[model samples]
Target: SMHLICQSGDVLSARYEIVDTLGEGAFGKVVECIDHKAGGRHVAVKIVKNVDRYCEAARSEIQVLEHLNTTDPNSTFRCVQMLEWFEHHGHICIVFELLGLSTYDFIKENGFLPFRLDHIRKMAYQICKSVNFLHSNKLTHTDLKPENILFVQSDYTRTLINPDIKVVDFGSATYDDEHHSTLVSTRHYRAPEVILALGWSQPCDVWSIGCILIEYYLGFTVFPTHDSKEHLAMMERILGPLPKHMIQKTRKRKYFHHDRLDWDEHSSAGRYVSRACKPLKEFMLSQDVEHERLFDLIQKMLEYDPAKRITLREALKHPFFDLLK
Candidate 1:
């Protein structure tokens, strides 16, 4: 169904009080409603079209939500809380807590805040904390981009008010122990392993985080490309070359080995390249007066070898974020 309207007297599960539209996507539409049986609590209803796709992605989201519910200490009220799932009229409805604006929208309105290193550190710390929790449970949030992260308003204050950010949208997430498929994440934020078709691990999340950090710093994505070759070329320009050890590791994987045949022919030298050809340090220097350490961290995070990339846990402890804690 392309359109779903819930007006007065409409009843879902014989209880929910449909209020208004929250949002909509390729899957279907989400509506804001109040649960009468659940003590009049407000919730967002994700109404999906097909049962197969709905179950496929929604089940994964449920798993991640369950994990976060058990392990996360930070206020999950910041994250969309899934309440229940039900099927009616061949449509799947996923009930979740209604929240605030996305980071994408926030950045769009504010036009990228000034170089407040402390804000970056706070955001990164919260993100890393979430990633670490997932990694420890043998799960990987395959999709980790700015759009999937959300922020909630505290009281009515705008300036100086810390908007607590939380990770959302687990549709593409997978448990590391169960899935070995490499293709995941959005194009620019995707890890090199995924780009090379090499099987990826938990480290892919860390790479995405790094890309997001750079985007936050530069007000744009570093590796903007329409094709895989362009992406590889971008990586080469930024990080020099992909070391031979990394190539060997890539070759061992079936997906990478298939792409390896044409690696040499490509000008990127099998490295991920970014269109933002300016040296990363130069970009940082332009943004902040004192950005040497953060620049170094970006270089390390963007390393071509997944094995060599700094893990999220280690990154949280890095001196770059020392002042945040």
Candidate 2:
């Protein structure tokens, strides 16, 4: 027999009890549920949005997630583990080991203050490690936004050391191939190489890692625009000129010519507007070795040329993370 969408206090699968709503996503609604038979363990249930591509997408995500867990349990995997999955109300409900505050929420709960440099460094390394592991298996986490990276637990009391962070949300995971859509990543963190319709793979993830870390330190997104043209403009403003050859690869080249960019209503870089980039030092605590080390790593991740962008392994191996160990 089928049932309606679950509500707080409702029991699911005769095993898990819904406690409250967590949040919703592109693929499903999430709710906090308690497993009474198995201690008081809490799990987050991602109920499929509905059948169709939605169903296929969720299953695909779980396949890779389970793959990681099989290779190295959450003890070694830095992401929330898939405890199990079942059916409810003609939809798929995948249960994940409950995790804590998202990087986005973690920053705000602390008053939008910058995390200690040390903590940020370790977070970066961990993210790199997780992504590297995924890439090693030839999978791409097409979506690696701040909301998907979470603290291992509910504690935010420490600002000086690395809090264990897990990379979650495989809803957008895909094989590193041209077959995946160009519009995979959230637009703000979207790589220019991808926005131009160029073939992208794991390196696109590295670009997102760069955007997320900068946002962590600066308390905002590096590229705030939503429109495709405005997004490119913001990217150019911060990263300097885009490579001419890369632009030639796109049919949308009409909007971008040399230093000027045009989009929507009478828009263009105008060859007149000052496009100087702000210095990275403005955010770091001091112009010390640690700060320099971080900026260097971010630079590699944000390289406009996809071929030149650092891979996840190279990022994890960066000397910057040495501070953590």
Candidate 3:
């Protein structure tokens, strides 16, 4: 069986007392636990599935988490802090300081209510800094969607007083010097280069970050399509056509007729893209000064060319974040 057998009342390693299940995925389940050996400190224990492949992925995660912890021992980087890890019954278990709801969950719970610009700014700043730190270490977080970002506290009865967040899920993170997988990242956030099979790098994360910001701003994904052809169509509708050279390089020739996307703009999918998508500038909810700057920042991030995309460091220096400093 791939699943690890554990109960709420079970005490693991005579140290962590499982309190409840937090969440589960193909990777396995995460449990809320109390560290008996550490003065009953609350923590999250991620128990990997017993399957060989999952166990291997868990081990890879441990290596990445350990490197992150070693580099940012004080937890200054807005990344989740890994407390410890151990093997239990052939399943790898990772201990981490308990945190609140993921940004995705929080937004969902709030009835898909978009965050205030101020809140978005605060959260976005922390995300950029954290990802920037990863880049500094030559690491690329291949996956950087809203689900991977969590708030440090959940006491948001009103607008958040402190919109603090920690970026999670480093299992897919890869060092720049390591193998750059041809396919990485969720579809909506996937950069053109990645989908084009041209290659990828840290800039891929930048593109994903851009998508995440749009999610926070709109309270929904900007590109809401499952098909690759439709996804490219949504991009063209919102951000303009893919660069001709980029379009030509793809093996997905069926997706294009000459240099233009091969599709009837009057078809059902095109009609949906028209109704559900809008130009990037039209996404601004207000005429306030910050909106233009924010649009500019995301535009730079969503650049079709990976080489031309803004670096995390340069993004941090953008005028949009000037007020934060």
Candidate 4:
């Protein structure tokens, strides 16, 4: 069983006119289609892999999408609106409104350039509002990295004309009542609780938001480490000591010595951590008031204790977003 081989001009469900493939990922291929039935409006259709597991996962996403669409039918929360879904042959396809380049791609193409503080503030506020809506619905968007944040339209002369964004890829979303996955989120954006196996929930998404904003502000990843020990070292180097209580309870016993990270500061990995990470304040490019507010907001978001992490609702009220008001 391979992917559904379709060419340009092919029609699916006898209504969507296949324009071209958008992109492909672990989920499957996303194709641009012109919905002739809906006034020939352009849309993106996610063609799920024919594998049983992917099909099952897509089905679950459909439920979350359905609920989100019905609850926010007006698209007020900035979540990607799922237009419709149906099966074509053996693959389950989900259709959505067309969006432009992802935030990560835009940054990548521009030499990993950071956005203006005002732009970051507006984007961050929109992101928090959307994720807060999810939390209110008792759902968690387990993966909330930059790649999942997309602009409504990317065409611009010099700067992004429309900084409006939509959060996408809800396939990994989990309901509060459902079984929690042992692990979630991409490595760089992963929370310390997830790495320590301390059990995670909605707070994990909050942590990811903190990481994403840092990347947007600094134009690079702050906590850059793949190894768990190295990752812990990076977090400590940037955010300060891991709370003693957290260190005492973490199931990842090998990463610690007594109460501190048991890492070799002289090793190549240690050298890398030293070179790549800095005190949270050191990352600030300037002592501007906007930078101060953003760093403060992120500090709360990156709190070691998830129980103490700032909730999205409170984040919306932070002064960093005061400009939006």
Best-matching candidate per TM-score: 4
lDDT comparing candidate 4 with the true structure: 0.89
lDDT of 3 by residue, 1-325 (tens): 4243568888888899988887776788889999999999999999988887678767878899899989899889978998889878878889999988788877887899999888888888899999999999989998898888988987577466678999988888898778777888989889888887888889999999999999999898888998878888889988998998887788888889889999888999889999988889898888788988899999999999898899988998898887788
Candidates' lDDT values, in order?
0.70, 0.78, 0.87, 0.89
Better of 1 and 2 by lDDT: 2
Expressed as tens digits, the lDDT of each residue in 71-161 for candidate 2 is 8764464867898888887788899888877788778767888777767887888898888888888888889998899888776443523
Residue 171's lDDT in candidate 3:
81
TM-score ranking of the models = 4, 3, 2, 1
How does residue 227 of candidate 2 score in lDDT? 73
Q: What's each prediction's clash count?
A: 7, 1, 0, 0
Candidate 1: list runs displaced more than 4 Å: 5-11, 73-80, 111-116, 154-160, 248-275, 285-290
Q: What's the TM for model 4?
A: 0.95
> Across residues 65-176, which tens digit of lDDT does each residue of candidate 4 receive?
9999899999899899998898888889999999987898888888998988888998999999999999999999999999899888856664677688999988889999
Give stretches of model 3 more than 4 Å off: 1-4
Name the better of 1 and 2 by TM-score.
2
TM-score of each: 0.82, 0.89, 0.95, 0.95
Give the TM-score (vs. native) of candidate 3. Answer: 0.95
The 10 consecutive residues of candidate 2 with the worst lDDT sum are 270-279
